[model samples]
Target: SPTLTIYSGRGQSLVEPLVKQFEAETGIRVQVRYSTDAQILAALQEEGSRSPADLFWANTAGALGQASAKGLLRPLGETLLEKPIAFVPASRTWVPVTVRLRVLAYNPDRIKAEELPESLLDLPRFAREKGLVGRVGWTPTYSSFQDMVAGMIALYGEEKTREWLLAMKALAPKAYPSNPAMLDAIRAGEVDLGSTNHYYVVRFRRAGYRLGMHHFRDGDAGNLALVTGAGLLKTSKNLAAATRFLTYLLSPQAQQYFVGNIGEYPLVKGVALDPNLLPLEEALAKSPKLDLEKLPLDRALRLLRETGVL
Candidate 1:
């Protein structure tokens, strides 16, 4: 049988089951290299046109945008261009499969919604004022967090973002490796709040955890909505097969998989949303207007290092 190779940045646990379903339904064998987005980007750079990957799927728009900028992706045409503008880059080389918002997660038992700051820019000050400085948790290592930092740099100038990071760092906020870990700490009372993706909170609450979540004020940097998407590799030798896979991803089944199975907002229109999640329009309205394709990924990293926030 024919095979399709996918360089997937999303966790294998969340993606493998869908891969299997695709394979079983279509009889197209799939070869997936599961790794972080950074690793896949490096591999794409090193391998170039000689790369065997038929598709590149990542949990961060930063990676997909970088790939498109480097001319590593093929134009996906109307199939992907039909998606929401927030989900489509200017290059039209990729399509977002899912969306997630940066959210403040807290334990109601430890903190009150009224105590949270309306603007994420004031988070450090709010924590200090409430005497909750060192009791906040964040995942500096996650790509979602990095994307938010990139959005901050785009929305706020580099210097202001640098100052904000330094201020938050001075508070000595606890750092976790991932969103779920940060949320777990909040639930255990080890921290009063967590800076994480809204889906993590929804998934945890669905599991019966008592975590409370709030979106930052409209247009605040903390209200950033990050996208997870895929692009067809320009070098794909199996174009027909790969295009089929991309089309399948936009099907109701696949989009619903992202909503119900992964707790993310599906980018395809008409897909039913998880009731616990904010409507896509509402979430989009709250997020700052920033171009994901133009995200200053390198500059964001440089600023993080310079501010000692990484």
Candidate 2:
């Protein structure tokens, strides 16, 4: 079989070593191109059947689902991945490799835990009352947040979601380019609070940063969304090896590695999370379950465009 080329959105810090380890184990040459999820998708779309990617690994399942819906991924068939742990969908077009939950990261010195909003819906109200219209930070350009907003629209009505967005706009939350940058802003006290994936906080905390994360426990729109998905490209030349890599990624050993190094919650059953992260039971207790596939990506994008954030 020919060497495998993988297009991944995960940063080199997360995947490069794993790729090298995989190569060492299998002795199969692996070529990896790292880029943002949007860039990877555009590359695949632009390359069409001539795409060199054997696999597409990234953090957005909604985008991957959209790609699958659009026929950009090949249907995967493997008994090893037939069943995964919590928050993973039973789909053949793509398999979830890891899971990252949506969380509210706050500067504890700036905001009191008791004063924090119980639900995300209360954030706008709190902002308006405090007159911090543009003082908060969020990456409106991020597909993960977009996906979360889409989930809200599906759970709540269009009118409700639009009203919330308008209120948020009126509050004037600062929009950052990426989650890590947003988290950095909060740490520097640039903003009081922001939304982010749970792992970002875990990683920062492991690095000895004083950041607080709130897992929304009130309702469906509380915890934002969980994402970390992988898919086999339709043009892959090494299907068997690609399958093996995907299966390995979902294995318990790999899941433990994710929790240990990246601070992400493992998606495989019986795998324990790092002691530094919030206990899985506690985290899950506060996490509101939503049908991820129902997230309205198009509507959310339109909302962002209307708000001039996109």
Candidate 3:
């Protein structure tokens, strides 16, 4: 049987085991090259019709959507996806495999719960009022951040979101290359607070890190987006194997693997998540209703560039 090659931009630590398990179960070889999303996309673009990757997996839907728009992915037919998957877009090119809710991870010793900003919009004000200069961290270049900005644009309009982004830019939070590194910085008390997805925090806590999670209440722009998704590469030479791999990913066993080992909530119904992780329904209820397909990627990118965050 031919091997299925996957170009993944997600952290290798969380996914290598899943791929190994999948290979063991099906007796098919699998190859994964982990890199940043931008690098993977560039490779795909350069490969054009000759790419060896059978699938593309990443932590940001916006990046995947951009890949789809660039004709880098094959349209995953509707029949492959289970209907009504929560937090997943109703698109055919890519399917969400997991989700992460964006939240502010704060050091309790430095800031009181009540003292924290009520909304993300108030963060800059809080930074100025409380003199939290250089005490916050953000993954400005991450596609997840771009998706969050895009969500804000969709909800508050481009002008309002741009203003908010500008305010955030002026605050000058330390920029980290990835979420795990940001979490590490926060745990080390190098920064009082930081923005990150839920699982990273949960994993850190499980490993004995003293960190507090704050959901941006009061309908703040902070919400969970389809942070991780899987796509079939347009240049796939092993479509059948790739489809089989996707099916295994959505299977109950694989879902269990995710929850049991990686602290991710399963999207499939009746699948239980890790006790350390929030329940899927509860997590979904906390998330804002934003259409992933309609996210204005270009506009968000332009704004990020203007803010010097890109």
Provide the TM-score for each candidate, comma-separated. Answer: 0.93, 0.90, 0.91
Model 3 earns a TM-score of: 0.91
Q: Looking at candidate 1, what is the lDDT of residue 16?
A: 91
What digit string (tens of lDDT, one per residue) describes model 3 on residues 1-310?
Answer: 5678988887888889888888888999998999866678778888888788898887778778778778777777666665326645555788777777788898888888888876777888888898878888889767777788888888889998888877877777899988889888877877888877787788888888878888776356785545577889877889998988888878888777777777777767777765656777677677777767567765788888887887
Candidate 3, which segments miss by more than 4 Å at Cα? none
Give lDDT tens digits, candidate 2, residues 1-310.
4778888877777778888888898887888888866677778878898888888886677767667766888877757556566545555678887777778899988887877787887788987776665678888867678777877887787788888888888777888977889999999978888988888888888778989887566455758646677888878888998888888788766787888888877777788765555776666666556656445666777777886777
The C-alpha stretches of model 1 lying farther than 4 A from their native spots are 83-86, 274-276
The superposed Cα distance between candidate 2 and the true structure at residue 280, in angstroms, equals 2.3
Instruction: Report the error of model 2 at residue 108, Å.
Output: 1.1
Worst 10-residue lDDT window, candidate 2:
80-89
Show where candidate 2 strays beyond 4 Å.
Answer: none
Candidate 2's displacement at residue 224, Å, is 2.8
Ranking by TM-score: 1, 3, 2
lDDT of 1 by residue, 1-310 (tens): 4569999988888879999999999988999998877778889899977899999988889888888888899987885568554568878888887888888888899788987899888999998988886898887767788888888889888888888898889889999977777888888888889778878887898898788888788999998988988899988988998888888888899988988988888877788975656788887898888788788776777787787777
Task: Name the lDDT of candidate 3.
Answer: 0.78
